[PDB]
């Protein structure tokens, strides 16, 4: 699945961009998780943190969640509790995976905005 030469694989934490919304954190999933259909070549199914819904998104409309400060939207974060909830669940997941200990958002956000230290982006990988 997803053998199209384009970026991203199953389990990858990503920012995803669909019409009408800020960049939003998501996880790349298999089409079978979606009970929908196979993604068009060049595209990935993602499941969004916060609301748990699925979108089929172009691999060119996805970036690694690791590039955090570059896509974090501070205005959206201040404006929307749904975005703040989305950030928590996505960063929680980021934490567990990498090795990171530490309104409980604060040091998660700082750690994220700071570049996911000590581990770096490398510790965001799925397995």
């Amino acid at each position: 699945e997803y053998q199209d030469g384009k970026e991203f694989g199953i389990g990858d934490l990503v920012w995803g961009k669909i019409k009408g919304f800020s960049w939003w954190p998501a996880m790349v999933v298999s089409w079978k998780a979606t009970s929908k259909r196979q993604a068009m070549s060049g595209m990935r199914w993602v499941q969004w943190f916060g609301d748990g819904k699925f979108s089929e998104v172009s691999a060119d409309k996805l970036v690694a969640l690791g590039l955090f400060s570059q896509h974090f939207n501070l205005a959206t974060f201040n404006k929307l509790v749904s975005y703040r909830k989305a950030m928590y669940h996505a960063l929680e997941k980021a934490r567990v995976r990498a090795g990171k200990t530490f309104d409980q958002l604060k040091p998660m956000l700082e750690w994220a905005h700071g570049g996911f230290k000590p581990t770096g982006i490398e510790g965001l990988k799925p397995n």
């Binding site: 748990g52 699925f54 979108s55």
Partner: peptide, 7 residues
């Protein structure tokens, strides 16, 4: 409240 996200 489930399924596919609507833009």
């Amino acid at each position: 409240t489930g399924g596919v996200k609507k833009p």
